[PDB]
């Protein structure tokens, strides 16, 4: 009960972090858990409609916060709903340029290293590398 | 680095064609602008009262001091000096000050005919290190260019460790962007125009 | 450090066991100094072999000199912070 | 007969071509569309980069183009823009902080920066008074490098605002950016000092809201529209046409931008 | 059933000062490189 109450206050802005750190997706994931969104959504159902709407809105904004400021400015120019596809396309274009610049085997190793540092599932990394390879030809 | 990131970091190389000449030209122009501001205004022009070259003056000085070599007598540093010694010291001091201002950094004679104060010795030592350092830097920047390594400095970092250390990727990605950009630029100016 | 371990081992052998190191032991030390790039320890070991043993393997002496002159070209002859000019009140005493 | 001035600052050719097609198809040829690098009125600037001749960089949340996520939010983000010199020349924002370290005199540059900040502060307080807020939020990057430009920015912005009678709260860049993206309803008017990071924050806010057109106030006196994406540029053109005195065309462009952001030209 | 955890508490991001290789190019740029490291640490502490 306390965790959900703390999370709701944190997202609403009533409750600040110890060091007044920004309320980003990464920090929340670090403390509350990987699936904080799911448990919060289930908990919100036990609250009036207004609080439910606020929780949904705050969750959506936090998800948008998962990108850096530069990425948002570059890719979120034409709305947030189209942000994910635009970011994915730009990343794919970078992958194509990398492949055309320094081969494939190095690109395969580079993608693997970034995925390890980027906290990416092997399936997602494999899908990305296949997509960029297919885009090349 | 908790949290699945949306994108895999890739080199920020987007200006595929950035000629080294243009970068060094811009560095030169900025360097010239800063130098002009620091110095201020070019000093008012001066017209020479007499025409003579530095080489001619040095030759005349050598001729003047060569005829008195037999008469010239050495003595202890604390002992009083002679007319020939005083003339030699003054002439050589002026000559080597002019040479050092011009650019002929011959420290062997400058340390002899210009050093008379501990502050002067400190200034000479500071100058001596600087010239040698620039010569070494230019040589290795040339030897590095021949090899093909990036012109700019590269820090001794292990980004896989940095990703693990930091929690949020944003500062880490920003740091990589800066250093990658720095390593892809030539922090060199045209020293012909600067000297001019 | 490999060099430190071997020197300590020699110290144990000569002092606490009363056994004189032979040429083979010193050659191993010199090889490690050359391999690790520590060209100043090589000079000291070179004299040790020239003093206790009979000379040094001239292959290794030349290798060490090559490493030293590489540093001179690259400027890594001494740590740089030592070369920085300091003063009475310009030194940070931690 | 009439003229619309298109400025390009770091914008891809696709966006500029899209803007030209939109204006040509909507206007119908009555108003010509010329391209330049500086203007004071009837100007649309395309691209993240700041054009030459702009001192204020205000941006708001238009009611019509509010994204469903950010429905009801009302916060005005004004970025102070110092005079822009040629790309090769050292910019004032950097000269004001490096010359002091080098010991060079910094009198004229300080005077120019002071004038720009005063104008930006006057714009910010006017917006704050119009909206009715009592306190504004200054944003200054807390990096050690920018220890002089920000100091002057605070010294002047607070002076002007306090002279006007409103309160000022100073903050950094990361905290304000997170607040503006997550909880923007707690900020009424936020001024931003002239730094690259602040420019990115302004663009991110203009994009996250759903795509809007930024207003630039120039030295000559006036307002010019600014966009960086298809939707933002389309809204900027729609506002510009409205200023010229075209209402139906402006509404059509706005509706097309709302419906089909990336392909407004074909949508309308 | 005692206290479990302060979800509010967050471990501060422990900064690390960047270290440059000791070459002649570093000595010439010692002041400039040091400024970059100071800027990097300031960014890490504040966040951006």
Swiss-Prot record, chain C:
GO terms for cellular component: mitochondrial inner membrane; proton-transporting ATP synthase complex. Disruption phenotype: RNAi-mediated knockdown of the protein impairs assembly of the F(1) component and slows the proliferation rate of procyclic cells that are cultivated in vitro in the presence of glucose. RNAi-mediated knockdown of the protein also slows the proliferation rate of the bloodstream form of the parasite, despite the fact that the organism can profit from blood glucose as source of energy. Mitochondrial membrane potential is dramatically reduced in the bloodstream form that relies on ATP hydrolysis to maintain mitochondrial membrane potential. One of its GO terms (biological process) is ATP biosynthetic process. It is a peripheral membrane protein. Transmembrane segments: none annotated. Its main location: mitochondrion. It is found in: Mitochondrion; Mitochondrion inner membrane. Keywords: ATP synthesis, CF(1), Hydrogen ion transport, Ion transport, Membrane, Mitochondrion, Mitochondrion inner membrane, Repeat, Transit peptide, Transport. PPR repeats lie at residues 22-52. The keyword Membrane applies. Mitochondrial membrane ATP synthase (F(1)F(o) ATP synthase) produces ATP from ADP in the presence of a proton gradient across the membrane which is generated by electron transport complexes of the respiratory chain. F-type ATPases consist of two structural domains, F(1) - containing the extramembraneous catalytic core, and F(o) - containing the membrane proton channel, linked together by a central stalk and a peripheral stalk. During catalysis, ATP synthesis in the catalytic domain of F(1) is coupled via a rotary mechanism of the central stalk subunits to proton translocation. F-type ATPases have 2 components, F(1) - the catalytic core - and F(o) - the membrane proton channel. F(1) has five subunits: alpha(3), beta(3), gamma(1), delta(1), epsilon(1), plus the additional subunit P18 (Tb427.05.1710) that is not present in F(1)F(o) ATP synthase from metazoa. Subunit P18 (Tb927.5.1710) interacts with the alpha subunit with a 1:1 stoichiometry; the interaction is direct. Subunit gamma is part of the central stalk. F(o) has three main subunits: a, b and c. This is ATP synthase subunit p18, mitochondrial.
